[PDB]
């Protein structure tokens, strides 16, 4: 009984979190009112990992919904599976964070953080053996970014030896809400470098390019981007939610994916990504080629610009596990110049029989690549372009922050880039 406590914070965090629970609830046979109606025991095998069992065989997600304004969480409570969440697990304020990291981290967010921890503590106290935590949020806003990283810091203080995992949406000028997103992302990245064991980096630009170019969506919306994220989240957690020839908890994954404590930022992806030629069967070679294709990854980083420290691949559906090993060993033994040669056998493969809704088979990609430094370089350049002129800083100094704290966050991320650069050579 290795329970995971899920936390979603801010607009982005709660809208992506909502879709996540919608997806896996369908995969586990849980209906919008928390009643099970599946047809396979594999659905209830590891169901307790993400769900609490209440009276009357009801399953309630072990989820905590956090925000500094009520709007987004009112939508969730009115959304498809809104009734499935615990009413007490909604923790929200009224002021908002104004897309301001200082507000989420130091002022508005500090006022609300204790009540969130009360819910976290209450969920942990009912876990037979808490695996760890996962947080969904963006880094470009104020609540998910500023208050999210504050939450992580206080969770680490209270549960120092639990695994802290996040799905972090990185901002992009192409899919931007405000100009201060580089400020908020740079401030959060340092928090994550210190206080998370694994962070799945999701770039909104990659999500846009996939919806536009691959999925042929003329005008992608945030909902379309969230379809990809919820799908990706289902893929990476398949290892944990279903049974198979793998006994892997969050700490075991971290031990085999994170060779150095600060380089724990992953590029995720999956296949297929098909536009509506959607009923065709996808062969294992096709699944494997696409999964390793940069167009199928959501960090907007070209892996051919760096080297893979570790790679994990999860295949779902009834397929040839023999043919999988052949195609996987075909991608490595055909591009070994992109895998570091000083971590033997650093590409691992897992199979899950239960495929996603509406797909015969799929493949989820989780890469720890030094090419992720391109993402942090983009943020750093945008940050510096404004910070050199001290542009928009008054929104932050007005919340008690000082320029010195920005200078240090800038140095911290430039150091992180230099760290990736030395392991790429």
């Amino acid at each position: 009984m290795r329970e995971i406590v899920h936390i979603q914070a801010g607009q982005c965090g709660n809208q992506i979190g909502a879709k996540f629970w919608e997806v896996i609830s369908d995969e586990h046979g849980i209906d919008p009112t928390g009643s099970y109606h599946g047809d396979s025991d594999l659905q209830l095998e590891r169901i307790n990992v993400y769900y609490n069992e209440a009276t009357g065989n009801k399953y309630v997600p072990r989820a905590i919904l956090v925000d500094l304004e009520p709007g987004t969480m009112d939508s969730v409570r009115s959304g498809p599976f809104g009734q499935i969440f615990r009413p007490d697990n909604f923790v929200f304020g009224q002021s908002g964070a104004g897309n301001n990291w200082a507000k989420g981290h130091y002022t508005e967010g500090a006022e609300l953080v204790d009540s969130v921890l009360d819910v976290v503590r209450k969920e942990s106290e009912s876990c037979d053996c808490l695996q760890g935590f996962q947080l969904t949020h963006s880094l470009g806003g104020g609540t998910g970014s500023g208050m999210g990283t504050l939450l992580i810091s206080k969770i680490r203080e209270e549960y120092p030896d639990r695994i802290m995992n996040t799905f972090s949406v990185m901002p992009s000028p192409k899919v931007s809400d405000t100009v201060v997103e580089p400020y908020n992302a740079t401030l959060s990245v340092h928090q994550l470098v210190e206080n998370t064991d694994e962070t799945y980096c999701i770039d909104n630009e990659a999500l846009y390019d996939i919806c536009f170019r691959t999925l042929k969506l003329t005008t992608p919306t945030y909902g379309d981007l969230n379809h990809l994220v919820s799908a990706t989240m289902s893929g990476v957690t398949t290892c944990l939610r279903f049974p198979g020839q793998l006994n892997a908890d969050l700490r075991k994954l971290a031990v085999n994916m994170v060779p150095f404590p600060r380089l724990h930022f992953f590029m995720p992806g999956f296949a297929p990504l098909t536009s509506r030629q959607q009923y065709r069967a996808l062969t294992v070679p096709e699944l494997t080629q696409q999964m390793f294709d940069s167009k199928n990854m959501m960090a907007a980083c070209d892996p051919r610009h760096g080297r893979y420290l570790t790679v994990a691949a999860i295949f779902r559906g009834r397929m040839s596990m023999k043919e999988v090993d052949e195609q996987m060993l075909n991608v490595q033994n055909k591009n070994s110049s992109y895998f570091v040669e000083w971590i033997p056998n650093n590409v691992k493969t897992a199979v899950c029989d239960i495929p996603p809704r509406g797909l015969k088979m799929s493949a989820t990609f989780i890469g720890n690549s030094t090419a992720i430094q391109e993402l942090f370089k983009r943020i750093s350049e945008q940050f510096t372009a404004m910070f050199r002129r001290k542009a928009f800083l008054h929104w932050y100094t007005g919340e008690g922050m000082d320029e010195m704290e920005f200078t240090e966050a800038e140095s911290n991320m430039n150091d992180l880039v230099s760290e990736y650069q030395q392991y790429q050579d």
Binding site: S153, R156, E157, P160, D161
Partner: protein, 54 residues
């Protein structure tokens, strides 16, 4: 090619063939190791808490 020490019983037999002649830490010391590593864990966790308190 000699056969020596042939032993036979109801459930089997065994023998030997020669083709050619020839030409700790005490209980206390383990406890110190276990406690030593435990202390280093406490020191590391104290520095983390000191970091978080700052």
């Amino acid at each position: 090619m000699e056969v020596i020490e042939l032993n036979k019983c109801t459930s089997g037999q065994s023998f030997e063939v020669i083709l050619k002649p020839p030409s700790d830490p005490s209980l206390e010391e383990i406890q110190k190791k276990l406690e030593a590593a435990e202390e280093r864990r406490k020191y590391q966790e104290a520095e983390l808490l000191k970091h978080l308190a700052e």
